[PDB]
């Protein structure tokens, strides 16, 4: 039947493909509420396309102007502002799946209300599970609440898992179906055939270089030093359940390939695809059928070669980094992370050399270490990390 | 639940890839017989190291012959000859899975046997679906036998495809599954990068490598053509939602794109024991003396759409494909005399193809049985003969 959704996070490009995959499937998708920080304009023009019952600005001055522009664009919605209505939006009783797309640590607490909410969580926050998995996996199992990835390499991985794991995300025990690891690909950014020599050296504009489509500046640092897929290691451990032996990095440069799985009998399971997010969105959304998604099937004629590398730590430090911190827990990826957003900013700003990043990271994560939970408590110590971080850029400064 | 085998076909590579996986799992896998057809000396030797049940010879003098030779290396076991003992070890009632892996005309009627009684088959054989694929499936419905596909290809495509699916091959609705297209795959053959004029030249020694017949039909992927009928029947394709796409590294063992964009492709070492673990195992996975696949070693993946004037035994299978089993019929039979002629130095390479064609066109100018379709073979092969001598 019907599908009842909420997006928070409407205005930005996984909203955009959340909703062009709903405008490709009229008769099963419904759109109740749509969320925004504070982009009116964009708001405003959203509402009047699809009339929401609901529209939320985070900024409560956004919202008041927003409520002017929609009592006639759109009299049918309600307007309502702060973190509050947020919460609200993402728990309505008649919502069945909610699009947790906000960035950042803002997205937290929205996102955990729709989970004890228990409701379908189209995961798209990465701090949910890199700064608090734990507290996250546990409220999942409390309220029933479904857990659905998007981020393009999780949701490679859900599709190329077997169907009782997929249903068990949180709690699976791999091994017992027959899973011996799953490998989380990437492409190893601009540096990935670079010497180790030179990175010392390199500059902003030289890390940025990306594919024609585009990063925020500071993912696109995180690609480079592969710190992005220490994070994603950190969240497939949690979403798949997965123990020191059972998760795994290679390169693949292209990014044809999305992830894998590898089974016991020596199969291995592959998902490739065009690079849109409305593939993996789309199947957020349909799970456990299928749905079109406006993307085009991906044409075997253009893709090229496909190769595979063998990451090293003497290029991908924060790798390790992140890999470390990973089993240490949500003291060590919360801190890990705050750090990280410090000396990338620091390394744009001119700052700090680019093979500074690590040294950071690495610093920082180590004081913490040597000194239940909470999102507050998890946030004190985002702001304690920061400050350290603070420090000791002025030092390699 | 130990599961309980017969292993139709045991001396080739397929029943020694079967047994390696029945090693690594003593506790779940039981060998109750072992057929094959007149290899007495693998055949006792794979008897001594498995003391089965039973072991049948498809060949009554090499019947003879191992049951002599088993009073001493396997006493236990009870020797049987003949068609219908291939019969009766395929449906004893004891017996939960047979791999049918008997080749050729001859592995049919065992196969069809292990079908009527219901069992697990573990297909391998060609011809049952290349030849008489309707047959097959109308069976398979009215016992409830499942069918679980050996071949590289079918076998992957099997594991891309979603569960409700995988349940109900022979009549699956693909479409309403969110399947667009199935990707069969396969190497392209020693001609892939050869410019086309060159093949009226081709000798024998430059069509093989790595089964000479089979490797003449990688050549021409006339191979492919037959697994591309087979996957029709498989998973109840229509040629839209078929498409052939050439792999020249083998890494990528076949796909299915689905409907939102997305992508499953299977791949592994090149080892059949990974296929047939499936076979047995589903739908829990078993260990299968399989290494996990070396990324360091693959190199790179790549990929070609055929040309058919590069393969024009491929275009006859698939049209062939959707005309019918008569059809499919016709244009196997025609292709062993074709091969054989080639082999033979009677006939140049490109001219396989003239003669499937020609054999093609007149029979089809023109209820069914496994008698009537081997009768069918048999003039195809007849009319294959006339259509050779004459080159
Ligand atoms: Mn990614
Ligand atoms: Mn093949």
């Given at each position: 039947?019907?599908?009842?959704?909420?997006?928070?996070?409407?205005?930005?490009?996984?909203?955009?493909?959340?909703?062009?995959?709903?405008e490709q499937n009229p008769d099963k998708f419904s759109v109740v509420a749509l969320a925004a920080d504070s982009n009116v304009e964009?708001?405003?023009?959203?509402?009047?396309?699809?009339?929401?019952?609901?529209?939320?600005?985070?900024?409560?001055?956004?919202?008041l102007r927003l409520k002017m522009a929609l009592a006639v664009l759109a009299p049918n919605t309600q307007v309502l502002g702060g973190?509050?209505?947020?919460?609200?939006?993402?728990?309505?009783?008649?919502?069945?799946?909610?699009?947790?797309?906000?960035?950042?640590?803002?997205?937290?607490?929205?996102?955990?209300?729709?989970?004890?909410?228990?409701?379908?969580?189209?995961?798209?926050?990465?701090?949910?599970?890199?700064?608090?998995?734990?507290?996250?996996?546990?409220?999942?199992?409390?309220?029933?609440?479904?857990?659905?990835?998007?981020?393009?390499?999780?949701?490679?991985?859900?599709?190329?898992?077997?169907?009782?794991?997929?249903?068990?995300?949180?709690?699976?025990?791999?091994?017992?179906?027959?899973?011996?690891?799953?490998?989380?690909?990437?492409?190893?950014?601009?540096?990935?055939?670079?010497?180790?020599?030179?990175?010392?050296?390199?500059?902003?504009?030289?890390?940025?270089?990306?594919?024609?489509?585009?990063?925020?500046?500071?993912?696109?640092?995180?690609?480079?030093?592969?710190?992005?897929?220490?994070?994603?290691?950190?969240?497939?451990?949690?979403?798949?359940?997965?123990?020191?032996?059972?998760?795994?990095?290679?390169?693949?440069?292209?990014?044809?390939?999305?992830?894998?799985?590898?089974?016991?009998?020596?199969?291995?399971?592959?998902?490739?695809?065009?690079?849109?997010?409305?593939?993996?969105?789309?199947?957020?959304?349909?799970?456990?059928?299928?749905?079109?998604?406006?993307?085009?099937?991906?044409?075997?004629?253009?893709?090229?070669?496909?190769?595979?590398?063998?990451?090293?730590?003497?290029?991908?430090?924060?790798?390790?980094?992140?890999?470390?911190?990973?089993?240490?827990?949500?003291?060590?990826?919360?801190?890990?992370?705050?750090?990280?957003?410090?000396?990338?900013?620091?390394?744009?700003?001119?700052?700090?050399?680019?093979?500074?990043?690590?040294?950071?990271?690495?610093?920082?994560?180590?004081?913490?270490?040597?000194?239940?939970?909470?999102?507050?408590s998890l946030l004190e110590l985002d702001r304690m990390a920061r400050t350290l971080a603070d420090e000791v850029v002025r030092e390699?400064?």
């Amino acid at each position: 039947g019907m599908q009842k959704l909420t997006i928070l996070g409407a205005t930005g490009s996984i909203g955009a493909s959340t909703l062009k995959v709903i405008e490709q499937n009229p008769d099963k998708f419904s759109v109740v509420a749509l969320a925004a920080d504070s982009n009116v304009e964009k708001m405003q023009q959203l509402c009047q396309r699809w009339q929401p019952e609901y529209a939320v600005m985070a900024n409560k001055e956004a919202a008041l102007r927003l409520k002017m522009a929609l009592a006639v664009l759109a009299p049918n919605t309600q307007v309502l502002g702060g973190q509050e209505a947020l919460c609200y939006v993402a728990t309505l009783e008649q919502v069945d799946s909610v699009m947790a797309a906000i960035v950042g640590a803002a997205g937290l607490v929205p996102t955990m209300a729709a989970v004890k909410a228990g409701k379908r969580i189209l995961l798209a926050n990465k701090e949910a599970l890199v700064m608090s998995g734990q507290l996250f996996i546990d409220e999942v199992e409390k309220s029933g609440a479904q857990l659905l990835p998007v981020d393009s390499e999780h949701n490679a991985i859900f599709q190329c898992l077997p169907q009782t794991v997929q249903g068990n995300l949180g709690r699976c025990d791999l091994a017992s179906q027959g899973v011996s690891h799953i490998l989380l690909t990437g492409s190893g950014g601009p540096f990935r055939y670079t010497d180790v020599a030179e990175l010392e050296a390199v500059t902003p504009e030289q890390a940025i270089a990306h594919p024609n489509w585009s990063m925020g500046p500071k993912i696109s640092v995180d690609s480079a030093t592969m710190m992005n897929k220490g994070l994603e290691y950190i969240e497939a451990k949690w979403l798949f359940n997965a123990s020191r032996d059972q998760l795994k990095v290679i390169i693949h440069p292209q990014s044809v390939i999305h992830s894998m799985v590898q089974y016991l009998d020596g199969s291995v399971l592959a998902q490739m695809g065009e690079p849109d997010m409305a593939t993996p969105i789309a199947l957020t959304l349909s799970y456990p059928e299928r749905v079109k998604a406006g993307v085009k099937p991906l044409d075997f004629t253009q893709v090229g070669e496909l190769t595979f590398l063998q990451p090293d730590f003497e290029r991908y430090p924060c790798l390790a980094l992140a890999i470390e911190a990973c089993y240490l827990g949500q003291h060590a990826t919360t801190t890990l992370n705050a750090a990280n957003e410090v000396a990338v900013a620091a390394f744009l700003a001119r700052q700090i050399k680019f093979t500074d990043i690590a040294r950071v990271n690495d610093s920082v994560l180590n004081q913490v270490c040597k000194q239940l939970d909470s999102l507050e408590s998890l946030l004190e110590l985002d702001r304690m990390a920061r400050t350290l971080a603070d420090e000791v850029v002025r030092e390699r400064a």
